[PDB]
Amino acid sequence: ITRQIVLDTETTGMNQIGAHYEGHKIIEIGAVEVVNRRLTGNNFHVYLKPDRLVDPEAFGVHGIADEFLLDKPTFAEVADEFMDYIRGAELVIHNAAFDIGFMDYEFSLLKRDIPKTNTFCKVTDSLAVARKMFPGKRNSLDALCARYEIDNSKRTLHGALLDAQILAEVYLAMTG
């Protein structure tokens, strides 16, 4: 009856000062649907053309090459379906402010008066939840994988769908 969408993004990078997303772009969105504590398998996964370069640090994390993104859709091209997918759900995101910041930024660039994500989705920060559950402990997604015996062996490089799927498993266990 209620949908949870476990979501992750990869980006061109991030700013350590000021708005973390300014001047950066989402290059991958990965989102997995959970209904009644079961993955439905109906997911959303896109790579996006950023029309700027990936910062070396970000490339160190996700390995998504500039060349790979050249033929991909723009955020504008996926935004409608993305909104249709997430609307009304509880979004579960590890360090939610990061991705939500990027999402609202990208939505805002569309100049379509799209309201903030948290006005049409519930936003749950699984990192805050993990910190509450495991105060004083490591709470990276990888740390949580070890804690909950979730396979992250394929996660040498981070990817948005990969990370969202891993987080969904972790979060189900956290709330189970």
Residue 163, marked binder: yes
Binding map of ligand U5P across residues 103-132, x = CB under 6 A, - = no contact: ------------------------------
Classify residue 129 by burial, with Cβ atoms within 10 Å: 0-12, 13-18, 19+.
middle
Q: Are 32 and 168 in contact (CB under 8 A)?
A: yes
Q: Which of 20, 24, 45, 158 is catalytic?
A: 158
* Two structure tokens written together for 148: 């909950």
Cα of 84 vs its chain's centroid, Å: 16
Q: What is the four-CA torsion angle of 167, 173, 175, 176, rounded to 10 degrees?
A: 160
Classify residue 16 by burial, with Cβ atoms within 10 Å: 0-12, 13-18, 19+.
exposed
Q: Residue 158 catalytic? A: yes
94 binds ligand U5P (CB under 6 A): yes
Q: What is the DSSP string of 71-83?
A: TSPPHHHHHHHHH
Residues 45 to 74: which contact ligand U5P by CB under 6 A?
57-58, 61-62
Nearer to Mn ion by C-beta: 78 or 101?
101
Q: How far is the CB of 160 from Mn ion (least distance, A)?
A: 5
Binds 123, which of Mn ion, ligand U5P, none (CB < 5 to 8 A, cut-off by type)? Answer: none
Catalytic residue IDs: 158
State the residues that interact with Mn ion by CB under 5 A. 8, 158, 163
Annotated binding residues for a divalent metal cation: 8, 10, 163
Binding residue ranges: 8, 10, 57, 62, 163
